[PDB]
Amino acid sequence: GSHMNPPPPETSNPNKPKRQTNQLQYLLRVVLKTLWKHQFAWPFQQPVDAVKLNLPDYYKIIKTPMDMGTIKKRLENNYYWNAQECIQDFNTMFTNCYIYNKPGDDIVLMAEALEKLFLQKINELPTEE
Numbered sequence: 001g002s003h004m005n006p007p008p009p010e011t012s013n014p015n016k017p018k019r020q021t022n023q024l025q026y027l028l029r030v031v032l033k034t035l036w037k038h039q040f041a042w043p044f045q046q047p048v049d050a051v052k053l054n055l056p057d058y059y060k061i062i063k064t065p066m067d068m069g070t071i072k073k074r075l076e077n078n079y080y081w082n083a084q085e086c087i088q089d090f091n092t093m094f095t096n097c098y099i100y101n102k103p104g105d106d107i108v109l110m111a112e113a114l115e116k117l118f119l120q121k122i123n124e125l126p127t128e129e
């Protein structure tokens with residue numbers, strides 16, 4: 001896309017060691033699946049396109065971007081070593097939204113609905129085996 005958007009977060013890197021865990025499997029099959037199909041998922045399914053949105057300050061403010069399209073690729077392409085790395089990606093995505101936008105803006109209400117679901121699912125993250 002535009003040269004004025006940063007490159008997306010890394011989803012491929014052979015030098016980074018990879019592992020499947022049961023918790024990572026749950027993150028894809030339960031957590032990502034649940035949030036991706038939610039009515040309010042669409043703004044979170046790809047990197048913020050600051051050019052298309054006319055938000056030229058977005059990447060001035062948000063220096064650690066994350067989105068569910070990136071997370072989906074990371075899960076499907078086994079990028080992670082553990083569940084904490086992926087959970088941190090989700091939390092980064094939510095916090096970016098809460099930092100950039102005014103409380104009570106529609107996008108914040110959308111994020112909060114996804115976060116409530118996320119929390120419920122992560123409370124049930126299975127014991128690592």
Ligand SMILES: O=c1cc(Br)ccn1CCO
Binds near residue numbers: 043044053055100101
């Ligand atoms: O902050 C966010 C978060 C998502 Br998810 C989409 C767009 N923006 C910018 C405001 O529209």
